[PDB]
Structure 1
């Protein structure tokens, strides 16, 4: 066997829980139990995700600390995300479309 792993261009189905530095969860795909689906490496998601989610196999978890320069910047993303907030994501890759 040779598990495929995420590369630029893949379509990923991703669970995430994002937290502030204050520990407080701002968002998660887990409560609705709805994976976020997107094309990796296309500027569809935050820069910290595009550079940070490479080389994941299905079923693998990763933690990403993402200072605001690589997230939503000083602008922020109201209501949940303050301008300048460092985000802490715990992500779980569920599915890479390419393998099937």
Structure 2
């Protein structure tokens, strides 16, 4: 959703570990910095379409290693109000331990994240 959009690889290593497709552009200008408390709503899918979780705010500290790796990397690239879809390889998410019983080991996952707000360190 929607086809003209191609997953841009945002993994800092550029190993295609995190492909982002902006679903809805933010109309704002502000963006999160490492250390900020961010507020988002999300939904998580297994590649086969199984919805494993959903804030439907969820909040956390950006760039502290507090959330999934794919998350620390993606949210640092969203405008407030932006909705995006990120495709996460196992190692940027749950790895080989998975999350019983909802997420198997070595699961490539897909997240729809909407950035609502953030507040400075």
Same fold (TM over 0.5): yes
- Could you say which residue in structure 2 is the equivalent of 1:66? 88
- Could you say which residue in structure 1 is the equivalent of 2:30? 4
- Runs of 4+ in structure 1 deviating by more than 4 angstroms, as ranges, are none
Distance 1:87 1:66 in 2: 5
- Could you say which residue in structure 1 is the equivalent of 2:47? 21
Counterpart check, 1:53 vs 2:79: no
How far off is 1:14 after superposition?
0.9
Distance 2:80 2:30 in 1: 8
- Could you say which residue in structure 2 is the equivalent of 1:41? 63
How far off is 1:17 after superposition?
0.3
Contact 1:7 1:55 in 2 (8 A): no
Could you tell me which runs of 5 or more consecutive residues in structure 1 were left unpaired when the two chains were aligned: none
Distance 1:76 1:66 in 2: 13
Aligned to 1:73, what secondary structure does the other structure show?
A: coil
How far off is 1:37 after superposition?
0.5
Count of residues in correspondence between the two structures = 93
Distance 2:75 2:110 in 1: 14
Could you tell me which runs of 5 or more consecutive residues in structure 2 were left unpaired when the two chains were aligned: 1-27
